């Protein structure tokens, strides 16, 4: 699974589990450093950079859903995040980029080399790389659309 979000937006990284007995979920990153998890109805938060921005809908814990919510994204918040309950573990890759402004620039995570492509309402494709109506950046299957003004 991959999710991609716009810098300064929130994303809800989903994680779900089918156990009737009461369990402890964990979220961590590629480095195996913990961002958050539960202990009963309490929320526990590891020493990661995310904290402040990292949270979960606790009201959904009782029925299996253990989401990781990051608010106000930052390019370096891009990572492969892992939700573990016990022995199972879902992964979710997050990749976040925004558009500065016209020479347009696309700051992305290091590792990802994306391409922005902008198309006007009746005028057509201006496709590039990092530097350059609706601007779409491409990575994996989907992209994320943007904006322009005259």
């Amino acid at each position: 699974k991959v999710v991609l979000g716009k810098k300064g937006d929130t994303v809800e990284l989903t994680c779900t589990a089918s156990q009737k007995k009461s369990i402890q979920f964990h979220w961590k990153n590629s480095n195996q450093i913990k961002i958050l998890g539960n202990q009963g109805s309490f929320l526990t938060k590891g020493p990661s950079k995310l904290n402040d921005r990292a949270d979960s809908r606790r009201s959904l814990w009782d029925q299996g859903n253990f989401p990781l919510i990051i608010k106000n994204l930052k390019i370096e918040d891009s990572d492969t995040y892992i939700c573990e309950v016990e022995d199972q573990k879902e992964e979710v890759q997050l990749l976040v980029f925004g558009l500065t402004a016209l020479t347009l620039t696309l700051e992305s995570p290091p590792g990802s080399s994306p391409s922005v492509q902008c198309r006007s309402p009746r005028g057509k494709n201006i496709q590039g790389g990092k530097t350059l109506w609706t601007c779409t950046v491409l990575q994996n299957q989907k992209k994320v659309e943007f904006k322009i003004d005259i």
Binding site: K21, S22, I23, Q24, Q39, G40, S41, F42, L43, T44, K45, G46, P47, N51, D52, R58, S59, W61, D62, V85, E86, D87
Partner: protein
């Protein structure tokens, strides 16, 4: 549904049975009911004025009564019976316990609620042993009563919401014993043995009850800062400052309870420390971080039981 006798006590001797049974501290209807019942006792012992749930605000009659009757005992419902793993090698999970015994009712269970440490437990013996989850590395650690471990907290007496707690006892060597018995437990798991095995607090950005050590004294919820107690026993004091709160987060359900302001007098409690609640992250180095899982207290108290049906 197990009948929950109050207080009984201790005329409930047991008998050896020539059988093999599977035991589990977590997947277990005795401990699963214990947790619910303790949660129910939690809301009646210290009475909340308001309860905030996402959707609603529940206001009820509160005051400053405090039920100190913290011990109870289960007995089997009709057509069922209690078995127990009387093997000393039990570590909260065993599919082939051959030392099975049977009783009419369970041992005494301590109903107190706390994080990091369990207090006034039954199940204190002359050994440190470790209940360890079947799946997962959730654990509750019994401490050895050889080392005369207590906690002793007071609020004078001056400032209405401040308090200290002294950790009396041979903690120096009780704590290295738990480190050492983890090192030769059937899940070491990646470990060097001592020195490069350490106790760790959860993040401060965690809930108050996780970040601080939650407990109560004379019906007042204290929250203490454990950094001095952690500096002592790793690297600096055998006491800690704790501060009282009225808004607290509920351990079992998602919500907040608001309580009345503290008592006027000198508060003081004498408590025997009997368990560490923790999670073991084994390093191939390892860290044992303290937990606020709470329900696991009751899994130490009754996790060696099993309710079987007689058809």
């Amino acid at each position: 549904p197990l009948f929950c006798a109050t207080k009984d006590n201790d005329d409930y001797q047991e008998i050896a049975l020539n059988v093999i049974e599977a035991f589990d501290a977590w997947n277990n209807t005795v401990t699963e009911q214990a947790v619910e019942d303790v949660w129910s006792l939690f809301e009646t012992s210290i009475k909340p004025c308001v309860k905030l749930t996402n959707t609603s605000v529940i206001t009820e009659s509160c005051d400053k009564h405090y039920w100190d009757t913290m011990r109870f005992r289960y007995c089997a419902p009709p057509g069922f019976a209690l078995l127990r793993c009387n093997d000393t090698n039990y570590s909260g999970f065993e599919p082939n316990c051959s030392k099975v015994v049977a009783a009419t009712c369970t041992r005494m269970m301590e109903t107190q609620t706390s994080t990091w440490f369990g207090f006034n437990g039954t199940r204190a013996e002359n050994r440190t042993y470790i209940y360890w989850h079947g799946r997962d590395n959730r654990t509750i650690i019994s401490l050895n009563k050889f080392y005369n471990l207590t906690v002793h907290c007071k609020r004078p007496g001056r400032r209405p919401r401040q308090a200290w707690c002294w950790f009396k006892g041979e903690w120096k060597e009780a704590m290295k014993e738990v480190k050492l018995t983890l090192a030769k437990h059937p899940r070491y798991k990646g470990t060097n043995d001592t020195e490069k095995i350490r106790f760790i607090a959860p993040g401060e950005r965690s809930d108050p009850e996780v970040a601080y050590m939650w407990t109560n004294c004379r019906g007042e919820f204290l929250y203490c800062n454990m950094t001095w107690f952690l500096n002592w026993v790793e690297n600096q004091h055998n006491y800690v400052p704790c501060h009282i709160k009225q808004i607290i987060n509920t351990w079992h359900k998602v919500g907040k309870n608001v309580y009345l302001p503290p008592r006027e007098g000198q508060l003081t409690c004498n408590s025997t420390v009997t368990s560490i609640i923790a999670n073991i992250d084994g390093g191939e180095q390892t860290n044992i971080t303290f937990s606020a899982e709470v329900a696991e207290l009751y899994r130490l108290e009754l996790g060696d039981y099993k309710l079987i049906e007689v058809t």
